[PDB]
């Protein structure tokens, strides 16, 4: 019920999608997106630091974390907590590195607020095929457990 | 009004405090705490990576990010956004490294969910005196701007 309650707050439903996915000046392929919410979306990383490295971003392009409205802060953060639960179940881990590079001097390369979620294990470039496969595994799991 | 609205959601008021501040097996000195909310608190770091390095944690000891309730996730994350605004104004920066080491394999050393907020600038141990001084500067600024 905790995660089902978060999904209700995120206004999620199976197959919810956006017509387009903007990330800074870039456009994310719909095949790489595993979840869309009222204000955010989650997509697989083309340059993962480690396996299962995912990104969460706002549907509206906003550069800094402090540019987000209260509703967007809640949305992206409830999605983060929900995705750590999903990734935890999929990658068989309880440990994650969660981070925002909020600005150029924090290492931000794309001018659009995003959260990194990286599954972590002891002593730990991708094609559209591998990315679609990874996004499909995540999307399939969300659908199976949450309707 | 955005930040005043967040403070209302955090149930904050000038001088709001807790009888005790637990952080894992450790206890944080009240002099090092700059803000207390309905579910969280913010305190200055005794081993800062860079100047202005602060920590946010839950008042209730919870090990993993996924142990938090919906109300706690919202509280700690609205406080994070609010504190990036405050620290931004105090340390004269728009850039921050924001992170959760969610578990031992992510480098967590204290078994209690916490967010790191580190102000960042181009090409960037503390005594109770220095820590009290830093917490006082933060607390004084919050009070001045938000009542």
């Amino acid at each position: 019920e905790k995660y089902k309650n978060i999904l209700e707050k995120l206004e999620w439903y199976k197959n919810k999608s956006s017509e387009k996915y903007e990330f800074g000046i870039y456009e994310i392929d719909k095949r790489e997106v595993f979840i869309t919410t009222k204000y955010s979306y989650g997509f697989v990383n083309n340059k993962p630091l480690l396996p299962g490295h995912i990104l969460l971003t706002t549907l509206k392009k906003k550069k800094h974390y402090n540019d987000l409205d209260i509703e967007e802060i809640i949305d992206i953060n409830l999605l983060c907590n929900f995705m750590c639960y999903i990734m935890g179940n999929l990658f068989n881990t309880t440990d994650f590195s969660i981070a925002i590079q909020d600005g150029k001097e924090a290492g931000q390369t794309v001018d659009h607020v995003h959260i990194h979620i990286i599954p972590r294990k002891i002593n730990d470039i991708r094609s559209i095929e591998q990315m679609e496969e990874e996004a499909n595994l995540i999307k399939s799991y969300i659908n199976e457990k949450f309707s | 009004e955005k930040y005043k609205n967040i403070l209302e959601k955090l149930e904050w008021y000038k001088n709001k405090s807790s009888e005790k501040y637990e952080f894992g097996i450790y206890e944080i000195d009240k002099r090092e705490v700059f803000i207390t909310t309905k579910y969280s608190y913010g305190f200055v770091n005794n081993k800062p990576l860079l100047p202005g390095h602060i920590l946010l944690t839950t008042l209730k000891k919870k090990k993993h990010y996924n142990d938090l309730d919906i109300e706690e996730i919202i509280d700690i994350n609205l406080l994070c956004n609010f504190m990036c605004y405050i620290m931004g104004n105090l340390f004269n920066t728009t850039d921050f490294s924001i992170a959760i080491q969610d578990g031992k394999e992510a480098g967590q050393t204290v078994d209690h969910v916490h967010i790191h907020i580190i102000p960042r600038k181009i090409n960037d141990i503390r005594s109770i005196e220095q820590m009290e001084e830093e917490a006082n500067l933060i607390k004084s600024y919050i009070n001045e701007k938000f009542s």
Partner: peptide
């Protein structure tokens, strides 16, 4: 950034 994951 650039010394640990993920700073």
């Amino acid at each position: 950034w650039l010394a640990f994951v993920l700073v």
